[PDB]
């Protein structure tokens, strides 16, 4: 895994997705997935953004979606394919992260590797 798998190799590299809150809201974001294959860096604009708030544990993520699964996703991104597009659900208080991939092969990587992961 990790260093053979396609999908774990390309979030390695990190990703700029966009990042889907409203209509309007709709902004690039890079992710990455850290080499112990625990944590997701992830970038932020936030007022009182810190190093720790920009990381997120993967024990964290109930599912990852594909498709238009959510209704951020339904009512936002109803312009983007269905292949280029997923969400990432948390167990915890974290508002799930609907997002827009720059092409299927990302969204693919994506949806793919954090389910390898999270299984
Ligand atoms: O609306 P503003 O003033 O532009 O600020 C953003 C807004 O609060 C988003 O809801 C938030 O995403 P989450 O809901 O996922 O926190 C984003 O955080 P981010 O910068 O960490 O993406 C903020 O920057």
Same mark, same amino acid.
């Given at each position: ?12 590299? +990190? ?12 902004? @690039? ?5 850290? @080499? ?30 594909? +498709? ?52």
């Amino acid at each position: 895994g990790l260093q053979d798998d396609p999908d774990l190799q390309a979030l390695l590299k +990190g990703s700029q997705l966009l990042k889907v809150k409203s209509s309007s809201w709709r902004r @690039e974001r890079f992710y990455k997935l850290q @080499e112990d294959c625990k944590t997701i860096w992830q970038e932020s604009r936030k007022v009182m953004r810190s190093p720790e708030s920009q990381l997120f544990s993967i024990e964290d993520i109930q599912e990852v979606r594909m +498709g238009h699964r959510t209704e951020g996703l339904e009512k936002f991104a109803r312009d983007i394919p269905e292949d280029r597009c997923f969400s990432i659900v948390f167990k915890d208080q974290r508002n799930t992260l609907d997002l827009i991939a720059p092409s299927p092969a990302d969204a693919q990587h994506w949806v793919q590797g954090l389910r390898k992961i999270i299984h």
